Amino acid sequence: IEYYTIHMRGLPYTSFENDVFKFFEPIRPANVRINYNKKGLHSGTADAYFDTYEDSQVAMKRHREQMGSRYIELFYDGKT
Numbered sequence: 001i002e003y004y005t006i007h008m009r010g011l012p013y014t015s016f017e018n019d020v021f022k023f024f025e026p027i028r029p030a031n032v033r034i035n036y037n038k039k040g041l042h043s044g045t046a047d048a049y050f051d052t053y054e055d056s057q058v059a060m061k062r063h064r065e066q067m068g069s070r071y072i073e074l075f076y077d078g079k080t
Contacts (some may be wrong), residue, residue, distance in 0.1 A: 003049035004056035005077040012068045013042040027059045
């Protein structure tokens with residue numbers, strides 16, 4: 001299965017998958033992956049994988065202003 005990907009920068013180190021889901025609601029990513037280093041430290045970035053192109057494009061526009069109290073940078077990385 002192929003997904004449409006939004007790469008995210010600027011997440012707080014206390015924000016995990018459920019915060020990403022809250023960020024894009026009502027739009028629902030199929031899955032979310034928080035990025036860490038090899039010792040398990042939050043890297044401040046993440047990927048959100050959407051079911052359709054249409055979902056990913058709505059999510060690029062329509063989302064909360066902040067996650068926690070940080071502004072999030074979104075990058076549409078396309079399919080897969």
